[PDB]
Ligand binder design. Structure first.
Ligand SMILES: *[C@@H]1O[C@H](CO)[C@@H](O)[C@H](O)[C@H]1NC(C)=O
Ligand SMILES: *[C@@H]1O[C@H](CO)[C@@H](O)[C@H](O)[C@H]1NC(C)=O
Length: 568
């Protein structure tokens, strides 16, 4: 017997619970007997607990002298049988000592929600002060067995720290002392279970991160029952069920590279709901979208272009090339506007232009291109291989090749000529020509030497004059030699060279030269070639040469003075 029933002194019309528990091996089946055999009655009642191991005897309302007996608690297993006894005395109210316990305030009908605490009141008085006991659904309550959740207070009440459905019942408080026992009126405690389907306190939050790249997705969900929180990627779960948290569940992702979605799954017996946060890995930009030309100049193009991107963009990169002379690509980095002027171009050329955008991940693809042409300019160069001969004794035919650097559609040429070249060229005789590469002029004085110089022009303006060619109006004699070049062969030698003559049959060439400015004029005649090597000269000194051709009719015009020096 781990509990033994005490003798009780009770009140008429009151209650009297006798407690009797046993133990051992085998486990017993207890009983309650009066005078040997269990002569049962209406007002008496047994409430067996722990599978008939211990059992309370309850009597109510108490009557005197009917109920005043010694009662036997039987206890037996396969091996052993021992009784224990207890007496009941039952007094009327009018014959109670002054000190007999009295319930000043018993418990009240109480309602409370699960896990929240419940303080069941009981206040008594007597001499000596009575120790309080509680019965719930006719069974005594033991604060020890509750894990310190339930506890009796000196002041009187019984405290339930965390409510549970099981804590519901009729409650009776009982004031016990040397005089005897007194019960309170019963009072129910209800423990209501509010049914609330789940919702999210904090939703799972979408993010944009860099590649690797790490983010904690928090997800909080509340309700009643308080819902479990796990993570899913599509159809598969990620959090396990060994220690799956409730209410909260953070997902710490690390080293992310692919943009993936994630579902938080709030779940309980009442219902399931879900919310999806999408992690996105910031990507490269998109093509800025075809640029457009605003201005042009001889040397510049300037353009504007749409961002082409929903997110902002660190800067832009222009790439371009001359379509005219394919290649190479030119770059302009670190452009921080949607407007740019590409300068340092060459006039009258057309360029294909693209645009790319850069963000913190890198540089995106390029736009579609825009082809466009730079404006015109005056030519940077003169007509080439300018030539002249006589058709008659008084008219001259001149021709030339168009200049390598026209900077524009060539609108014509202009031809300056005279036989007093020491004047400025602007004073010379001059007239215009069309884009053709050849003209004539007459009204020339017979047996003379005219010098001729030619320039090209465009809508914009004049180019440079060619270098002076000159022609003698005597006919039959050959023309002035072409592009006479002189270059140093050795420390005592110079190699003269010139372009092959046109049609005219030259008998011999006539060469004249001298040392520096003030040296003796040497003369040499030789058979027709395009080059001649001058031998036996002085080291590191300068010589001046000029050349003319001879035909049967006579001596042609001389070149201008060409100068070159021997090695040194
Ligand atoms: C995520 O949680 C981990 C662990 O508490 C912490 O070390 C880390 O700093 C957190 N990162 C972010 C971005 O919240
Ligand atoms: C995730 O789902 C959203 C729903 O709008 C969709 O827009 C997005 O493209 C999806 N992303 C992935 C990685 O499946």
């Amino acid at each position: 017997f781990i509990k033994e029933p005490k003798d009780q002194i009770g009140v008429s019309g009151g209650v009297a619970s006798f407690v009797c528990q046993a133990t051992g091996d085998p486990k017993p089946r207890v009983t309650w007997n009066k005078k040997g055999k269990k002569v049962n009655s209406q007002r008496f009642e047994t409430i067996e607990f722990d599978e008939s191991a211990g059992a309370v005897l309850r009597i109510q309302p108490l009557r005197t002298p009917r109920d005043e007996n010694v009662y036997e608690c039987v206890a037996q297993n396969s091996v052993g049988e021992i009784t224990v006894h207890a007496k009941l005395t039952v007094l009327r109210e009018d014959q109670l000592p002054s000190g007999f316990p009295n319930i000043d305030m018993g418990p009240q009908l109480k309602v409370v929600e699960r896990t929240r605490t419940a303080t069941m009141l009981c206040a008594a008085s007597g001499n000596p002060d009575p120790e309080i006991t509680w019965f719930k659904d006719f069974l005594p309550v033991d604060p020890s067995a509750s894990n310190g959740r339930i506890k009796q207070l000196r002041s009187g009440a019984l405290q339930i720290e965390s409510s549970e459905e099981t804590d519901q019942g009729k409650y009776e408080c009982v004031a016990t002392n040397s005089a005897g026992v007194r019960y309170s009126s019963p009072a129910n405690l209800y423990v209501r279970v509010r049914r609330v389907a789940p919702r999210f306190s904090i939703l799972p939050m979408s993010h944009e991160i860099m590649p690797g790249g790490n983010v904690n997705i928090t997800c909080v969900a509340v309700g009643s029952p308080m819902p479990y929180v796990k993570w899913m990627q599509g159809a598969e779960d990620l959090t396990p069920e060994d220690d799956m948290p409730v209410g909260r569940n953070v997902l710490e992702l690390t080293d992310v590279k692919d943009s993936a979605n994630y579902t938080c799954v709030a779940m309980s017996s009442l219902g399931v709901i879900e919310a999806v946060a999408q992690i996105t890995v910031k990507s490269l930009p998109k093509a800025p979208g075809t640029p457009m030309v605003t201005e042009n100049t001889a040397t510049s193009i300037t353009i504007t272009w749409d961002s082409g991107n929903p997110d902002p963009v660190s800067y832009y990169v222009i790439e371009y090339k001359s379509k005219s002379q394919d290649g190479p690509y030119q770059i302009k980095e670190d452009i921080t506007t949607t407007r740019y002027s590409i300068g340092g171009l060459s006039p009258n050329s057309e360029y294909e232009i693209w645009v790319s955008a850069v963000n913190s991940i890198g540089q995106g693809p390029p736009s579609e291109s825009v082809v466009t042409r730079t404006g015109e300019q005056a030519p940077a160069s003169a007509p080439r291989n300018v030539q002249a001969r006589m058709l008659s004794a008084t008219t001259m035919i001149v021709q030339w090749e168009e200049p390598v650097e026209p900077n524009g559609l060539i609108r014509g040429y202009r031809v300056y000529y005279t036989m007093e070249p020491e004047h400025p060229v602007g004073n010379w005789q001059k007239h215009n020509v069309d884009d053709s590469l050849l003209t004539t002029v007459g009204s020339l004085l017979e047996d003379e030497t005219y010098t001729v110089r030619v320039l090209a022009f465009t809508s914009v303006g004049d180019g440079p004059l060619s270098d002076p060619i000159q022609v003698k109006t005597q006919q039959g004699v050959p023309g002035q030699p072409m592009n006479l070049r002189a270059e140093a062969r050795s420390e005592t030698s110079i190699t003269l060279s010139w372009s092959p003559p046109r049609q005219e049959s030259i008998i011999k060439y006539e060469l004249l030269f001298r040392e520096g400015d003030h040296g003796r004029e040497v003369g040499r005649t030789f058979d027709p070639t395009t080059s001649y090597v001058v031998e036996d000269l002085k080291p590191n000194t300068e010589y001046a040469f000029r050349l003319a051709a001879r035909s049967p009719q006579g001596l042609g015009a001389f070149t201008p003075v060409v100068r070159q020096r021997t090695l040194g």
